[PDB]
Ligand binder design. Structure first.
Ligand SMILES: Nc1ncnc2c1ncn2[C@@H]1O[C@H](CSCC[C@H](N)C(=O)O)[C@@H](O)[C@H]1O
Ligand SMILES: Nc1ncnc2c1ncn2[C@@H]1O[C@H](CSCC[C@H](N)C(=O)O)[C@@H](O)[C@H]1O
Ligand SMILES: Cc1cn([C@H]2C[C@H](O)[C@@H](COP(=O)(O)O)O2)c(=O)[nH]c1=O
Ligand SMILES: Cc1cn([C@H]2C[C@H](O)[C@@H](COP(=O)(O)O)O2)c(=O)[nH]c1=O
Ligand SMILES: [Mg+2]
Ligand SMILES: [Mg+2]
Ligand SMILES: [Mg+2]
Ligand SMILES: [Zn+2]
Ligand SMILES: [Zn+2]
Lengths: 406, 397
C-alpha cells in the first residue's frame, strides 16, 4: 500500500524519501538521546487532487506541547510582517459595528496584538501553552486548544460569527483539513473568508529548498492543490498573493463557493505553475534528484574542509536544519557546533545529529573559518552584521539554491 | 523635443496639461505668483527612454518620516553590506542620501561611505546620525574628486534620485571615474511597467523626469559603456525596479534581467501604441473620477481628500478637482497643514479634522498606504464612510 491522500483519499505517489528524522523542534540534553523519537520523512503527490504531502503524520501532541520552542516574535522581519498583516485584514475584511477576527496558530500573538490594539474583537487558538502565555501577556485572547470542527462550532455559539479566520504557517501543519474547513463553515459570517499563508511548493521546487520539508510541514501547498481542496470542502480559491517571507510563501483566500469572484491573480498563478510544470510528477522527481545532488555536494564540501583542518560552525539552529543534518549525515565531526540566539535552544543538542547549540556570542570566540548558514532566509541581515567574521577571513557556506561558498 | 539621453527625437503620448510645482504648498495670501509648467511625457524613438517633454527649472525644485521606508532602507543596507561591500576596506557612495537612513546602517557596520546630498537641511540630519556627507550634486567633477581623495568605490547607490536627474551622462562619467574594478551602480526608481499596468499616472510629476524600464536602462547603460547586469522588482512607492549596472563586460547579467525584458515584451511596453493605450486609460480615469465626484456633490454627500501627496497635484490639476468637489485634504505632515494644495488650492488640515465630523467619502490620494490608512480609520468605516480609489481604476470601497 502506498500512501492515501489525507485530503481526498486517493493514491499518493512518493517522490522524495528523506529518511529517518527526529522531531524538528525537540532539542536534547545528553540524557534524552537514547529515548529520541524518529519517524520516516517522505513526500508524495496525490495523483487525483495533486496535493503534495508527507507520507507519515507525526502525532500532533509530540510537536505542539507546552514547551514548543519557536516564539514568532524573536524575528524582527516577522514582527514587521505581522503588523502589516493586521493592517491588511483590518482594512479589507471587516464588516459592521462589531467585527471579529480569529487566528489559528497565533503563537506569541505577534499579529493579533495589533488587532487588539485597534480595538477589534479577536480570538486566537493556540494549543502550545508557553507561546500562548506570551500572547496573553500582550492582551490577546487565546484559547489553549486545537482549532477543529468542534472547537470552532462552540466558539460560533459563544462569540458569534467571524469576519475572517487567519492562519500563518499553520494550515500546512494540520493534516485534518476537512475538520478545519467544517469549523470555518460553522464559524464564518456571511461574507467571511479563510486566509492562510504557508511555504509555497513553487518556491521549494525552484530553490531546491528541501529543508522546508520537516515534521511540521505536512502539506506543501500550491494554488492548484488549494483550489482543488477548497472545492472539495465547499469553499473556493478567490485570491492569492506571493510573499517573500520564510523562503517564499503564498497567501490564499478561500470563500464559500459562489460567494466571491476569484481575482485575476488566481489564474495568473495557476499559469505560472503550469509554466513551471509543477503538476507534472516528473518535475517533482527532478526536484528530488536536485535534492540528492545538494546532499552530495554539501557533504563533500564539509568533508574536504574537515580534512583541511578548518573550523566549521553552523549559524542558526533552525527547525529546517534537522532535515539537512539528518538527511546528509552531518554530525559534530563535520560541524562542530551551531550558534543560535534562542535561549531555550542554547546548551542543548540538535535533533537527531546532536550538534551542540551555543549562544551567538560563541561565534566570535574565536571566529571559525566557515559558517554553514542554516538561517538562509536571513542571509543579508546575518552576513551584513557579522563584519568581524569576514574581516578575519571567514567564509559563508550556503546550500540554497545550491551549494556555494561566499 | 529631443531626448536628454541620446539627443534623438521624442514622441509625446500623454499631455497632463498645465501643472504646478508638486511640493509648493501655498499660504492663503500668496496664490498669485504661482508657477505652472506643461507636464507631458514622451518616448525617444531611438533609445526608448520615456521622459517628460519639458524640464522644470532645477532652481525651483525627509525620507525617515515613513516607517515603511525606514524598514526598506535597513534591508537595502543589509543587502549591500552582504553582497557588494566585501574586501578589506570597502567604500559605498550614495547619490541623494537625504536624511541618511540607509547609510546610517552602513556606518554602524563600520563600513566607509559617503553620501551626496545638496539639500543642506536633510544633509545635516544625516550628519547627526554619523553619516559622512558632501552637500554637493553628484556629477562627473564631484565624483572624480572623491575618487582622488577617497579611492575607488565598490558601489554607487541611488534610490528615488536617478530618475530626477536629466544629465545622466554626467552621473555615469562620474561613476566611471569613481568605481573600482568590479564596481556597480545600483539604483531604484518608479517603474514604467507598473505605471502602465496600474494606470498610476500620478507618478508623473515635476520630480520624475525619467520613467525607467529594463529596456531603456539597458540602452542607456550601453550608451555610457555600462551594462545592465541585475534587476529586482520592489513594491515600494507603488512599484519600482532596482537596476544594477557594471562596466560593459565586467559581469554576466543574471537570469532576472532576461526575465524582466521578457515581461516587457509580453506587456508590449516598447510599443508606442501600448503607451497610447495607457494615455487613453488615464483619460478614462479622469472622466470616471470627475463624474463620480460630481454626482456625489450633486447627491449632497461630503468628500474629503486623504493624504496631501506630492503626486496628488497631478491628479487634481489634470482632472480639474477643486474645493467644490473635495473640501479639504487631511495630512499628518506639519509643513503641509494649514496651507493650500498646489494649483487647485485644496485646504490641508491635520488628521484630527477627518473625524470632525466624519465625511461620507474619503478620496485616497495616499494610495501606496491603503492598508495602513484604512486599518486605522475604523470609526469612519463603522459610521458608514466609504473610500474612493483611482488606482488602478476609479472605484468605491
Ligand atoms: N489545530 C491547531 N489549531 C491551532 N493552532 C495550532 C494547531 N496545530 C498547531 N498549531 C500551532 O500552530 C503554530 C505553528 S508555528 C507558526 C506560528 C505563527 N503563526 C507564525 O507564523 O510565526 C504553533 O504555534 C502550533 O502550536
Ligand atoms: N545630482 C544629485 N546628487 C545628489 N543628490 C541629489 C542630486 N539631485 C537631487 N538630489 C537629492 O536626491 C534626493 C531625491 S529624493 C529621495 C531621497 C531618498 N534617497 C529616498 O529614497 O527617500 C533629494 O534629497 C535631493 O536633494
Ligand atoms: C536572524 C537570526 C536568527 N537566528 C536564529 C534564531 C532561530 O533559532 C533561527 C531562525 O530559525 P526558525 O526559522 O526555526 O525560527 O536562527 C540567529 O541565531 N541569529 C540571527 O541573526
Ligand atoms: C501613511 C499616512 C500618510 N499620510 C500622508 C503623509 C504624507 O504627506 C503623504 C505621503 O506621501 P508620500 O508617499 O508622497 O510621502 O500622506 C497621512 O496623512 N496619513 C497616513 O496615515
Ligand atoms: Mg527509505
Ligand atoms: Mg463563481
Ligand atoms: Mg556584532
Ligand atoms: Zn488527493
Ligand atoms: Zn534617446
Amino acid at each position: 500500500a502506498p500512501a492515501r491522500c489525507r485530503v481526498c483519499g486517493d493514491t499518493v505517489d512518493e517522490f522524495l524519501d528523506l529518511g529517518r528524522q527526529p522531531l524538528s523542534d525537540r532539542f536534547l540534553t545528553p540524557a534524552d538521546t537514547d529515548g529520541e523519537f524518529f519517524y520516516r520523512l517522505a513526500v508524495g503527490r496525490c495523483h487525483a487532487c495533486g496535493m503534495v504531502q508527507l507520507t507519515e503524520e507525526v502525532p500532533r501532541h509530540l510537536m505542539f506541547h507546552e514547551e514548543y520552542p519557536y516564539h514568532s516574535s524573536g524575528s524582527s522581519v516577522m514582527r514587521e510582517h505581522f503588523a502589516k498583516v493586521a493592517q491588511r485584514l483590518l482594512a479589507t475584511e471587516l464588516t459592521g459595528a462589531d467585527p471579529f477576527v480569529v487566528e489559528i496558530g497565533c503563537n506569541d500573538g505577534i499579529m493579533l496584538r495589533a488587532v487588539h490594539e485597534a480595538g477589534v474583537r479577536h480570538l486566537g487558538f493556540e494549543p502550545s501553552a508557553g507561546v500562548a502565555e506570551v500572547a496573553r501577556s500582550r492582551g490577546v485572547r487565546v484559547r489553549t486548544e486545537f482549532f477543529e470542527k468542534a472547537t470552532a462550532t462552540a466558539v460560533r455559539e459563544s462569540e458569534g460569527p467571524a469576519d475572517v479566520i487567519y492562519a500563518a504557517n499553520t494550515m500546512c501543519h494540520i493534516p485534518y483539513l476537512e475538520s478545519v474547513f467544517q469549523g470555518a463553515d460553522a464559524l464564518l459570517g456571511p461574507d467571511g473568508v479563510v486566509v492562510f499563508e504557508d511555504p509555497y511548493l513553487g518556491d521549494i521546487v525552484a530553490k531546491t529548498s528541501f529543508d522546508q520539508i520537516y515534521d511540521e510541514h505536512f502539506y506543501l501547498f500550491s494554488a492548484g492543490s488549494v483550489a482543488a481542496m477548497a472545492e472539495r470542502f465547499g469553499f473556493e480559491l478567490v485570491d492569492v498573493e506571493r510573499l517573500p517571507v520564510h523562503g517564499g510563501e503564498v497567501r490564499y483566500t478561500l470563500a464559500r463557493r459562489g460567494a466571491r469572484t476569484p481575482t485575476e491573480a488566481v489564474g495568473r498563478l495557476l499559469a505560472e505553475e503550469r509554466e513551471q510544470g509543477l503538476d507534472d510528477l516528473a518535475t517533482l522527481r527532478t526536484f528530488a534528484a536536485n535534492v540528492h545532488t545538494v546532499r552530495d555536494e554539501l557533504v563533500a564540501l564539509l568533508t574536504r574542509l574537515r580534512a583541511e583542518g578548518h573550523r566549521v560552525v553552523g549559524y542558526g539552529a533552525t527547525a529546517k536544519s534537522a532535515t539537512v543534518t539528518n538527511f546528509c549525515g552531518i554530525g559534530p565531526d563535520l560541524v562542530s557546533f551551531v550558534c543560535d540566539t534562542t535561549p531555550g535552544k542554547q546548551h542543548r543538542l540538535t535533533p537527531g545529529k546532536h550538534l551542540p547549540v551555543r549562544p551567538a556570542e560563541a561565534f566570535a570566540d574565536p571566529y571559525p573559518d566557515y559558517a554553514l548558514l542554516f538561517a538562509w532566509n536571513h542571509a543579508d541581515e546575518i552576513m551584513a552584521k557579522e563584519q568581524e567574521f569576514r574581516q578575519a577571513g571567514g567564509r559563508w557556506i550556503l546550500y540554497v539554491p545550491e551549494v556555494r561558498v561566499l
